[PDB]
Amino acid sequence: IETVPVKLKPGMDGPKVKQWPLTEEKIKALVEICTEMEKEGKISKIGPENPYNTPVFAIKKKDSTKWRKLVDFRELNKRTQDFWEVQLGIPHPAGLKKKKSVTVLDVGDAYFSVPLDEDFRKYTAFTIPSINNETPGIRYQYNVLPQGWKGSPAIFQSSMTKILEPFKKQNPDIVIYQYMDDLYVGSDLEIGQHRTKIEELRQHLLRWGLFLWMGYELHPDKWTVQPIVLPEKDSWTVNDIQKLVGKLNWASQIYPGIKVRQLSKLLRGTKALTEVIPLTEEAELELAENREILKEPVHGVYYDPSKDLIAEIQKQGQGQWTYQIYQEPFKNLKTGKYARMRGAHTNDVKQLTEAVQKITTESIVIWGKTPKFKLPIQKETWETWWTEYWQATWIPEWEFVNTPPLVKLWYQ
Amino acid sequence: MVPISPIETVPVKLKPGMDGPKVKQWPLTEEKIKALVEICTEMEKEGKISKIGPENPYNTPVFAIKKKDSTKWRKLVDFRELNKRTQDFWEVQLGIPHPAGLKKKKSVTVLDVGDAYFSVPLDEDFRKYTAFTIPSINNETPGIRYQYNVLPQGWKGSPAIFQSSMTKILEPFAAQNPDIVIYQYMDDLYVGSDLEIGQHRTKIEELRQHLLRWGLTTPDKKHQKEPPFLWMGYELHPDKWTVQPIVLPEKDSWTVNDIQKLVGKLNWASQIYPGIKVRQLSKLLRGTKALTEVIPLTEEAELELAENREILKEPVHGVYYDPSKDLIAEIQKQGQGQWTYQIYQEPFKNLKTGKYARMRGAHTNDVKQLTEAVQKITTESIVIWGKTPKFKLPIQKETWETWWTEYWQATWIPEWEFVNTPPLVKLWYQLEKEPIVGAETFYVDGAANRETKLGKAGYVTNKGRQKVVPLTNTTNQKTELQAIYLALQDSGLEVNIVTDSQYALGIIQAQPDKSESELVNQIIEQLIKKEKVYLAWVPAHKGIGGNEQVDKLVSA
Ligand SMILES: Cc1cc(/C=C/C#N)cc(C)c1Nc1ccnc(Nc2ccc(C#N)cc2)n1
Ligand SMILES: Cn1ncc(C(=O)O)c1-c1ccccc1
Ligand SMILES: [Mg+2]
């Protein structure tokens, strides 16, 4: 109550981001949601003297049949001041990624209890469009802390702390971490015990002043990585050896002492691709020395919180996807592979959208921020479809890869 | 007096750091001054403007213009400077409705709300910035100073503020009468419905009564404007729509300007006339940008033009949208990167048509283009109808399955069915996933001197077949493709090719079926003739025999 003053960064105006086309079902859902929000005082109609805009759409979270309003505050978040006044900063918990279970709660509804600074409200303008632009878009702004806005967890932080105080004091080994509208709650308890503690936690929030009932369950201690591994074969074709030398050459950019001199010598002459070549002893030794190097961690790898995280994804076929997260080239902080399913067996773009979400979740758990994605998809295809499969309350940044990377081969 | 509800003002500001305009009023002729004094006296009596004291330091120039063929004068206040200094507003007029998204109506009535426009009040604190000055006769007295009390014509905020004010007034009427539609365009309201005609006119009278509560009077006479409406380049009829007449001029010679106008008309026409093409005519606008320059029409452009004339020989109309039926979109390939489409609900009754053109780029293929066209039509359809149409596409289901499963990128097209209408989109080649037993293995390479542009390209094979060709006006990257071409040319129906060219791999892994590069085209033609091709990459300079042998041959 009684607002925290907020400003944009110096020398920049509010967001003027175009509203993208929405389907009839999403428009109807948003009309219904906003009519209720307006009745509850959360939002108010605005006039033409407000020229700002931020896009809005609607999603359905995992295992739910009701729409959730999702505002894309990516632009406003860049333009909003960083918050160092009330707090100096909140160091990210390295222990979160070590818990046997981490459950993710939507706590965004709590934010609606805090009024938004009157001078800042205009920058939260959004529009519910009409089909075929037949009626003027419905224009609103927020009166309270909006879900999805950078400033909300920052401004609500003192309120949240009081709410969770008796739960933290009573359960001192449970790790609680907040990112945007998400609360991440990790414990090493048996799944049933863990589940009751989550419901325990929920009741604290329910006790106070009021998609909270939902629970997205993670198990970061079981998360796996992808070291570089080489084939073990009894017979190598010329082709197999070419593939091996190529993979090793690529690996030598990551690992210093990798050698291919002896293996390259094996194919001496100009042989049929399918001809079997016996490994010499020298070549066998070299291969063995290479295997041993590849079992060690990469040298000079460190996280810098002042640098962006970058995430690259490759399509491997048959619903398999590989990815790497890094800050500097060849210095991977995290690699991985989803061989999984869900839905999307006949839908590449749904699969990719799920991959982006899971990777972003991993990123938040490990470093407490989202990575910038390099997506293997044409811009127009992605932009047309991603919102149909999105189920998270945050949205990362992305760019598009138009040239096929040769390195897909080596993460396979 | 019958009390009327005031229209709430919209608060207005200048841009940060800016002050109001202070622009000199230049002299007017004695005749213009008397005319302006008379005009402003009437406006002042109607409350639109007010005389102000000498304290106000702002000014905007005023002019008097002869309409034409009359003795009458009109006032023009030139707000260009104040507009530069006025804040931006939310503009609703962006995104006009497409006729194809409209619903058929039995009746559409027009109501004149001209009295409303010049009567919306201006933010009190902003009025001072609208000050103007009628110069005095002979400049022997102070000029008469006025400011606006209402939205001035020509001021930056007038359209947005008038639209928002009118919408707010209409909102309750629209909400409580879901059986009509109301649309505001300039000076008029348009009201449509499917009501029994007596009920329709009742609704119109009810609207007039509603508007009266704000003092907005509408003329007793029933509007002269009636269907068809000429609107934004369209003709709207009660139950169909079209573009206004498209007439292609006859000319013995054409200039840059003429062609740009030709293409504009064709583009406008293509939203309802199926099959319109503009590729060849657009090609003539390549570079240029010198307006009066005459360009000879290529035979290709002439054919394209003639094909368009035929399409435009007689009027075609679209039907309106029936929300109770599926939307269907059908696409045809036309050639040279051009695609055309129709969107309908009942067979043979298009809501609209349209076209899509291949994006610029060195290499491309039909499947990528069809995919892009699908995304474009999908996005257009969300805008117009709020939903994706079901697609009818000239590509076999098996062809699509092979494409998307093997393509290096994620890709998707929404619900669709094959339509067997030539030309069909197909895959012209697919590379092997494994090396081919029994197929000759060609190790290829090329190299070029970057100064002289002399190079060599060639191959050596496991059967001892070899070739090196000396080349002029080439580059390393080009020699790498040249070598691959030679291996394709000289091999049998199944072939393994080993290259170290990351460049060549990047192009071939993109699966082009057509290219601006004659050499890439020739490579594609060779691939099309093979039964099996496996393309293997190796790192350069690594002692990889075959590869090193040929690298040495082609070096020097
Ligand atoms: C956009 C629009 C322009 C004009 C008019 C602009 C002008 N001048 C008139 C109206 C009423 C509308 N609004 C809507 C909304 C939904 N369906 C329709 N259908 C519809 C409109 C006109 C005719 C006719 N004749 C037939 C059907 N119109
Ligand atoms: C077959 N083809 N088509 C175009 C070219 C070229 O060099 O531009 C070639 C070519 C010329 C010499 C060697 C290899 C390809
Ligand atoms: Mg070479």
UniProtKB/Swiss-Prot annotation, chain B:
Changing M186V: 58% loss of polymerase activity. No loss of RNase H activity. It comes from Human immunodeficiency virus type 1 group M subtype B (isolate BH10). Changing E480Q: No loss of polymerase activity. complete loss of RNase H activity. Changing I169A: 71% loss of DNA-directed DNA polymerase activity. 61% loss of RNA-directed DNA polymerase activity. Changing K453R: In strain: Isolate PV22. Changing V191I: 25% increase of DNA-directed DNA polymerase activity. No loss of RNA-directed DNA polymerase activity. The chain holds residues 600 to 1153 of 1447 of the full protein. The lineage of its organism: Viruses, Riboviria, Pararnavirae, Artverviricota, Revtraviricetes. Changing P228A: No effect on RNA-dependent DNA polymerase activity. Complete loss of RNA 5'-end cleavage. No effect on RNA 3'-end cleavage. Changing M186L: 90% loss of polymerase activity. No loss of RNase H activity. Mg(2+) 2 binds at D445, E480, D500, D551. Changing F442A: Virions contain primarily p51 RT. This is Reverse transcriptase/ribonuclease H. Changing Y503 to A/G/H/L/S/Q: Complete loss of RNAase H activity.
